[PDB]
């Protein structure tokens, strides 16, 4: 039950950490590598963002995850 102000900020923050910490780089490696082995027309996209969603959550440094779970709590409970 969020102040939609905070939502905008949480979204801006996640992006800033994920750039810094190399998460951005590694996800683009993964996609480029998957597509290179698949074929582009060959792929069935979302047969694709679905496949890697497990891997991407688990690539998140536990330090990043903790700061995020910090603010998400300080919001969901006011």
């Amino acid at each position: 039950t969020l102040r939609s102000q905070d939502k905008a900020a949480l979204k801006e923050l996640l992006h800033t950490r994920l750039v810094e910490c190399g998460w951005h780089k590694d996800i683009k490696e993964m996609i480029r590598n998957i597509i290179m082995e698949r074929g582009v027309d060959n792929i069935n996209r979302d047969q694709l963002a679905a496949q890697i969603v497990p891997q991407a959550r688990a690539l998140v440094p536990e330090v990043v995850k903790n700061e995020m779970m910090l603010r998400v709590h300080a919001a969901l409970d006011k």
Partner: peptide, 24 residues
């Protein structure tokens, strides 16, 4: 109770960050 709900927020914002990349 909010526990499960905090996990839905984080997981939704994160799946939305993957698409972020994915579009460009």
């Amino acid at each position: 109770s909010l526990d499960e709900a905090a996990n839905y927020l984080y997981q939704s914002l994160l799946d939305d960050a993957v698409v972020g990349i994915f579009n460009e």
